[PDB]
């Protein structure tokens, strides 16, 4: 039982350095995976920057590859998404997923796997 | 139930032994908390998944049991392999399991209390 | 059959001066009644300015009353809602909606009269 | 069909006279575009609305047909009352419509032909 909460997002030009960050509450110690899904309108969601809690491996999708950086606490229980070189494109409401199981890496970046979701973050770009 | 020493002597011909960087004790160390040593224990899940085999293998990614939703069946090993008798299939679906990238770290129990301690105190004294 | 178009909206500062603008095309002489939807996230959408192309009459919502001003033209078949004094809870996505009918005034602000939507425009504040 | 000047002598014994500051060659040209003077005259719509009355008053909104998608009804009188012989119920309706606040631009007979234009011509010569 956790319950993800999005914060940040907001306006920032092409270029500039916008921090969304995330947190887990009630059974924090069952998590696994923190990935940020990105429902860009007219686009069905789609996994961004998949994590590991323990470990800490990074994986990224190719659109955000050498741009987006993923971090967490394991103390805080919080995982945030770096963004920089935004562009036009990156538009759309990003959401911090997360599961309770331990999901292949191949599927870090699926919707579908994580069993838990935040409120959705808007991210926008000038 | 299988005998500890016994077991690592079982999972040491099987191959197991100095996989993905890791000694005899953890792999002794993780069954010991995942099924008590154990090949017929298995535990249901809220997602309707069932683990089955001494490492309690999820059914939901590694073996298709056919009752699960969604089932990945990446080890492609039917559940009833690894509830065999032997730890063959079960030894066998978990080196796909560590092989994964992320290693040990996967398995609930190993992580909670296999990591990071002595799990060489568990093959100490079994003479292998 | 009118199809809607909007235009202008983004990143603006709080109490900020902002000009959603929105146009008609096609038979747009059916064209009745003009109104600003805002889908909010996590909020179903709702009417915000309600608007008549001939008479004139604007109609607002309370939270939306002595702020934001709605007015079109005749000969440009294209209606703008200003907005002023914008705060956090302004932040949504506007949909110009349209109706090919005259819609009573207490439905006016209410989506299901309307039958013609047009691409939600992002409105940001800072 | 309805005659002109009996239809006007009707309506201003009906109180329509001087509703909503609108002089009685407004109503005429309304209804005589509206319906060409049939009190029977139906018209369907693309949203499956269908107009009734010689005013042509919208189902959807005015009277319950039973047959349209979302009936508000305000007026709340039936569809056949509208379509009685009479024009008792049409004028009766199109008394809230007109009152609803925008006046008589939401008929589009009016605002086509009897907005801004000479409507005292229809009703004149009339002896009213």
């Known amino acids: 039982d956790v319950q993800l909460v999005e914060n940040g997002g907001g306006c920032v030009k092409a270029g500039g350095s916008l921090r969304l960050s995330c947190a887990a509450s009630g059974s924090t110690d069952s998590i696994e995976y923190m990935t940020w899904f990105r429902q860009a309108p007219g686009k069905a969601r789609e996994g961004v920057a998949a994590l590991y809690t323990h470990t800490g491996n990074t994986y990224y999708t190719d659109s955000v590859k050498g741009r987006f950086t993923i971090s967490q606490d394991k103390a805080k229980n919080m995982a945030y998404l770096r963004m920089d070189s935004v562009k036009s494109e990156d538009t759309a409401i990003y959401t911090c997923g997360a599961t309770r199981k331990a999901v292949p890496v191949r599927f870090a970046l699926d919707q579908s796997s994580y069993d838990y979701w935040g409120q959705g973050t808007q991210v926008m770009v000038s | ?128």
């Open chain 2, 1 to 128: 139930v299988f005998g500890r020493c016994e077991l690592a002597a079982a999972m040491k011909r099987h191959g197991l032994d100095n996989y993905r960087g890791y000694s005899l004790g953890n792999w002794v160390c993780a069954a010991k908390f995942e099924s008590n040593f154990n090949t017929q224990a298995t535990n249901r899940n809220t997602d309707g998944s069932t683990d089955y085999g001494i490492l309690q293998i999820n059914s939901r990614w590694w073996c298709n049991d056919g009752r699960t939703p969604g089932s990945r069946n990446l080890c492609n090993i039917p559940c009833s392999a690894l509830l065999s008798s032997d730890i063959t299939a079960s030894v066998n679906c978990a080196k796909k399991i560590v092989s994964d990238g992320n290693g040990m770290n996967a398995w609930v129990a190993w992580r909670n209390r296999c990591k990071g301690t002595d799990v060489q105190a568990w093959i100490r004294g079994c003479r292998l």
